[PDB]
């Protein structure tokens, strides 16, 4: 029945909208310069960067940047998580694959929904309150100066599809309860769940993007650029830990950190 996958549908972006406060709507809204309700500083260069403080609520330049990336990815993770338990069945899971899901489900998170804050010009920062330039990004000093390229690529490609929120908030449940995570100990119930957020997307995308043909499978098709994405992000991560031994990464991405 199609009304039970679209009031999955509808539970899984009321819950997308109580767990993400800054939504694809909102970041859209702040980038189309025409609604100019509150307009982001844009932080293109040095003294830029040195005026966001004066503005935005904010050693190294390349370090002050990785690190604010670092605090919010921490705080995705614990949105995603949040979000997480919400998905129907999610946590009935052996804690253990919870856990599991969330570790190798919460990059490929964060990266789809850091497309929703990019054009491909640069990126918004703290909640919207600010926009970081894709040019002054790929400035900073090796190797901090390739991090953040291949997102920008992705992220232009995938808004191609003019996803919004609520096509969004499926496709994340979709990513989370994927059963060919490593170490997985019962990969059934998650196949069973995943199965059904598939319907639900595949309806979603029929019924919300009627003259998009093969959304669905284009979408699908995305979550290989995604795994890649991560695994580049960790060999560049593994020449920060060589080269800044002065450096820290927050504990709760160091643990979901784990190569291979
Ligand atoms: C480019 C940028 O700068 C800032 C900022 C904020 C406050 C102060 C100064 C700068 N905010 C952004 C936007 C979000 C950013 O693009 C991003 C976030 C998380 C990951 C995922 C990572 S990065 C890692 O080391 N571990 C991870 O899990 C990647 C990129």
């Given at each position: 029945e199609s009304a039970d996958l679209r009031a999955l549908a509808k539970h899984l972006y009321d819950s997308y909208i109580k767990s993400f406060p800054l939504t694809k709507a909102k970041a859209r809204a702040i980038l189309?310069?025409?609604?100019?309700?509150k307009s982001p500083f844009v932080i293109y260069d040095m003294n830029s960067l040195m005026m966001g403080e004066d503005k935005i609520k904010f050693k190294e330049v390349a370090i002050r940047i990785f690190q604010g990336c670092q605090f919010r990815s921490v705080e995705a993770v614990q949105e995603i998580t949040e979000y997480a338990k919400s998905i129907p069945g999610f946590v009935n899971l052996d804690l253990n694959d919870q856990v599991t899901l969330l570790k190798y489900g919460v990059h490929e998170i964060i990266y789809t929904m850091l497309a929703s804050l990019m054009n491909k010009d640069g990126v918004l920062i703290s909640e919207g309150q600010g926009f970081m330039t894709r040019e002054f990004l790929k400035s900073l000093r090796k190797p901090f100066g390739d991090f953040m390229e291949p997102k920008f690529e992705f992220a232009v490609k995938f808004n191609a599809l003019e996803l919004d929120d609520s096509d969004l908030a499926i496709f994340i449940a979709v990513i989370i309860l994927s059963?060919?995570?490593?170490?997985?100990?019962?990969?059934k119930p998650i196949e069973d769940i995943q199965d059904n957020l598939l319907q639900a997307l595949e309806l979603q995308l029929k019924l919300n993007?009627?003259?998009?043909?093969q959304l669905f499978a284009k979408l699908l098709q995305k979550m290989t650029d995604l795994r890649q994405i991560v695994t580049e992000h960790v060999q560049l991560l593994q020449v920060i830990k060589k080269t800044e031994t002065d450096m820290s990464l927050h504990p709760l991405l160091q643990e979901i950190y784990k190569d291979l």
């Open positions: 189309t310069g025409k609604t100019t309700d059963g060919d995570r490593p170490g997985l100990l019962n990969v993007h009627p003259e998009s043909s």
